[PDB]
Design a protein around this ligand. Structure first.
Ligand SMILES: COc1cc(=O)n(C)c2c(OC[C@@H](O)C(C)(C)O)cccc12
Ligand SMILES: COc1cc(=O)n(C)c2c(OC[C@@H](O)C(C)(C)O)cccc12
Ligand code: PRO
Ligand code: PRO
Ligand SMILES: [Zn+2]
Ligand SMILES: [Zn+2]
Ligand SMILES: [Zn+2]
Ligand SMILES: [Zn+2]
Lengths: 339, 352
């Protein structure tokens, strides 16, 4: 009698019908696979707004104990949950030609070195009687199979609408599911701290820019990105918003992203100071969240399970009490307000 | 500095960026033209859900005194307001090739019969900030039907019958209005979602029915096509097709519609089984009908949804359920409102 999603044949239509059924009161959906089940209570994420090149993308969350998240756009749908501490994404594109391009893209690195457990890290999901309907990627198993070299860092009455204006770097190709996952992880990292949804509602937008980094250097790239915003007339009057140059790859010495530390404050934001750069590749979730953290004043953390750890860890939440205080204050929150 | 929309150059991006910024608290937008101004307070319609072939379409309403409505999908955006009693729509498609096809489609009948004040009934809006292709089209439906001299259609015998025919819920019931594009038919997204928006709003306007139901419209293609121009024979086959369709098994308790762009024999705008829905007795795909989706006849799907919910032909020419096509979109008949609200689980004790 309960609704369910079969991960052995999950398509865009499967996720789209289920997620489009979720009312304001939430919906119970059972995630089904071979040797797997999970009843989740899905609800619409009504805090975050997303447009990718003017295309509305919706977010859905399960309960805290479900570790499940969803992304639903008109052309793609994503299911991301945690199973034995590993992140598993099911990415389904609506158009047959696009799903094949996406499946080819995600399958290519494994085609070089055949894996002992390829099906556990990456698998093409097929229709129940050929073209794939979705792809399954266990990020944690994939990074172990691919032997990927290390990428890292160095060094109110109504909530306020803050725009996170993402700009696809000139010459870059970013993938919709990949970009909106970095965005979903960024907003959720923020709303998890001190009940910040009462203070801010993040609106992510994505456009293309004529600006491209003049070299592989990330410091020179961000300096140039900030300077390009100040000279861009399409950004005149938006100097008080958050900005990100997004690309698929990384910068020199495998830098995942960069940003100006403590560059945003709901009352002092100006001169496009609150800007950064980020990769959007699926194998490194939480990079945009980590940079959005630095932009909101968060410092490098001592806990290896913290999002703001000095090194890249795959964790997506702020665990540091000092960082949570700094971030929430920058968004207008005070200790007297509570959580 | 309030936000505003210039109707002298309104594009998809213009409507999309404005409607996409509307928060849960609503937004004040000024509609600007050559001297005309209207401040409207837009808010998202959170009662109705719409997917057209799995593409999400959102609705926005102004205040009651604004007479303004919006439709926002990924590929098109619509603004529909009233000015001096006439219904004006601004239809903007996102893709250049699609906007040009749409502009050509809407302009074509006006080239056959060239009017002096064509600009009043129909106009291609161009990029003033400059441009070469249209960014949207303006259609004053009431002036267009007068210019085109469209042969009138009426709901004369638009219903058939069958010889068989508690408390306010914690959450209103989700009722799906499953629309199926007839085989061989081409329906236009803006046109279809306008018939749907007018159908849901006709329902929520009666006895505070949003507390009892939340309508969810979906659109798919069906292999069924009417075997003749007859509407009674068409609806009989449509209902039968549903019973023999396995993709509809377990959904016999929902509302159904065969949709097309044109009309049936003797210019019938649509048809449906009278008093075919009830939140507690709905079954066997009884609550089904057929409807045109052409822009020049707004309210046909609402009129048929009315018939499905038990509404009879009204006597007031300003009523939605009047037997002749009038262009009004609301039930004014006290008896029809009682019949419709009762079928959706409402009682006099509950109030409005
Ligand atoms: C090249 O960059 C941009 C490209 C582009 O198309 N636009 C419009 C930009 C932009 O618009 C304001 C936008 O966020 C609002 C608040 C209206 O929703 C802001 C910042 C940059 C751009
Ligand atoms: C031609 O008939 C149909 C064609 C078609 O593609 N489908 C899937 C239909 C259908 O889907 C269930 C739908 O309402 C839910 C509840 C999932 O949103 C229901 C009824 C009919 C169809
Ligand atoms: O996922 C879907 O809905 C369809 C079928 C396979 C490719 N596109
Ligand atoms: O809408 C899009 O996704 C295309 C791809 C590059 C930028 N514009
Ligand atoms: Zn860092
Ligand atoms: Zn981990
Ligand atoms: Zn995690
Ligand atoms: Zn009638």
């Amino acid at each position: 009698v309960t609704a369910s999603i079969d991960l052995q044949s999950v398509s865009y239509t499967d996720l789209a019908t289920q997620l489009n059924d979720v009312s304001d009161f939430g919906k119970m959906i059972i995630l089904k696979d071979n040797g797997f089940n999970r009843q989740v209570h899905v609800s619409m994420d009504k805090r975050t707004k997303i447009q990718l090149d003017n295309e509305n993308v919706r977010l859905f969350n399960g309960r805290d104990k479900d570790s499940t998240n969803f992304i639903l756009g008109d052309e793609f749908a994503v299911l991301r949950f945690y199973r034995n501490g590993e992140s598993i994404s099911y990415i389904a594109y609506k158009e047959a030609q696009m799903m094949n391009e996406i499946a080819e893209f995600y399958a290519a690195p494994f085609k070089k070195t055949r894996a002992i457990n390829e099906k556990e890290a990456f698998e093409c999901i097929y229709d129940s009687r050929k073209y794939p309907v979705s792809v399954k990627i266990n990020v944690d198993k994939a990074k172990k199979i691919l032997n990927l070299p290390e990428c890292d860092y160095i060094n109110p009455s109504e909530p306020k609408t803050v725009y996170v204006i993402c700009l696809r770097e000139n010459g870059s190709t970013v993938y919709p599911n990949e970009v909106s996952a970095q965005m979903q992880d960024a907003a959720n990292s923020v709303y998890a701290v001190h009940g910040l949804k009462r203070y801010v509602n993040l609106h992510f937008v994505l456009y293309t820019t004529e600006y491209a980094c003049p070299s592989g250097n990330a410091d020179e790239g961000l300096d140039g990105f900030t300077a390009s915003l100040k000279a861009n007339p399409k950004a005149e009057g938006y100097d008080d918003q958050i900005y990100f140059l997004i690309r698929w790859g990384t910068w020199d010495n495998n830098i995942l992203g960069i940003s100006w530390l403590n560059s945003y404050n709901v009352n002092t934001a100006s001169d496009f100071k609150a800007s950064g750069m980020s990769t959007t590749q699926l194998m490194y979730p939480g990079v945009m969240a980590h940079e959005l953290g630095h932009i909101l004043g968060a410092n490098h953390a001592d806990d290896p399970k913290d999002l703001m750890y000095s090194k890249y860890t795959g964790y997506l939440f702020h665990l540091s009490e000092k960082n949570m205080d700094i971030i929430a204050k920058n968004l207008g929150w005070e200790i007297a307000d509570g959580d």
